[PDB]
Amino acid sequence: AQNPNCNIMIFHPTKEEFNDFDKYIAYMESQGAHRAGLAKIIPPKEWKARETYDNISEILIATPLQQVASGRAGVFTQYHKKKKAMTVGEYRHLANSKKYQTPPHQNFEDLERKYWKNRIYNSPIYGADISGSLFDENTKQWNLGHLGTIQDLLEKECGVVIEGVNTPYLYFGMWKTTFAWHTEDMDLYSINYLHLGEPKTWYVVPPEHGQRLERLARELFPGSSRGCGAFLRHKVALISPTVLKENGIPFNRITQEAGEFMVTFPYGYHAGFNHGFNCAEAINFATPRWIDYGKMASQCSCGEARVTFSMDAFVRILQPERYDLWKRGQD
Ligand SMILES: O=C(O)CNC(=O)C(=O)O
Ligand SMILES: [Mg+2]
Ligand code: NI
Ligand SMILES: [Zn+2]
């Protein structure tokens, strides 16, 4: 078995190997990359997502989210308080202000220490889940707005034609902005490109060990657990690497820098934070190996997790028994 210790793998495709996205994902899995739950892909040096980022300031962040923490430094939840719209220019200025900017630090490790020590005492503002793309339409390779759709994958593998569309989302981050512990909707893959700015640190649990994370989470967030049998779908819970080590949960960590892709694999729980002002683009996708994970994915039916139009069809076709109760949650 390749990669038996489930380490995060880093790939350096050639321009030639960067032509066929599906085939490269399949290559990565042949080498065991999925075992980690997360891989890094460094694009060939000839590749570019677009010519420059000089003209992005007029993008609107219609609902910036202030991420308010509760709990203790290593075990907390966050809630998203909606703030007034601002442009990316305004947001960048805010991220760079004395109140919100990244503190002086030695290196990534020192900054990680500072994050876990101090995150709870601040409420950074995140521009998340903004429909859109920063890839130039002329970028032919690994353009997250030109991937094959999940609906087409399901049609190709299973023969059923369904409604729904699949488009990318932009994330504008600042110091301490945080993504809670989650897998993707319907345990899909995701791909994330860091277009610009400061890094993003990721933590990940191997898919084969995801249930160990869930068991810990139920112990650490006991009222949330009683409220919903899939409360990590709410995307609000954080657990530090110290806490995970104390409880024997297998995980890995890696820092993504501007110009790099990360791929999360089905049922790979991940969480992380941004180091300073940045912009990422991400999208879910499927492969044939995903199907069985989609069939088995947990669902939130308490009604908090409230998810896309397109997830309806996935649940309807892959989880017909759940369909009924899940849609009661969605309506
Ligand atoms: O970048 C972020 O804030 C969150 N991204 C993801 O969880 C992802 O790409 O799967
Ligand atoms: Mg603009
Ligand atoms: Ni994710
Ligand atoms: Zn729920």
JSON list of C-alpha atoms and ligand atoms in Angstrom, two decimals, residues 228 230-231 234 300-305, ligand 4:
[
{"chain": "A", "resi": 228, "resn": "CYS", "atom": "CA", "xyz": [-27.09, 17.00, 15.71]},
{"chain": "A", "resi": 230, "resn": "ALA", "atom": "CA", "xyz": [-23.31, 15.49, 12.12]},
{"chain": "A", "resi": 231, "resn": "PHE", "atom": "CA", "xyz": [-22.56, 18.80, 13.81]},
{"chain": "A", "resi": 234, "resn": "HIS", "atom": "CA", "xyz": [-21.91, 23.30, 10.80]},
{"chain": "A", "resi": 300, "resn": "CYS", "atom": "CA", "xyz": [-26.87, 17.46, 9.02]},
{"chain": "A", "resi": 301, "resn": "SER", "atom": "CA", "xyz": [-30.70, 17.27, 9.33]},
{"chain": "A", "resi": 302, "resn": "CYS", "atom": "CA", "xyz": [-30.99, 19.65, 12.43]},
{"chain": "A", "resi": 303, "resn": "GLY", "atom": "CA", "xyz": [-31.16, 22.44, 9.92]},
{"chain": "A", "resi": 304, "resn": "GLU", "atom": "CA", "xyz": [-28.05, 24.43, 10.79]},
{"chain": "A", "resi": 305, "resn": "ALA", "atom": "CA", "xyz": [-25.77, 23.35, 7.93]},
{"chain": "B", "resi": 4, "resn": "ZN", "atom": "ZN", "xyz": [-26.89, 19.95, 12.24]}
]
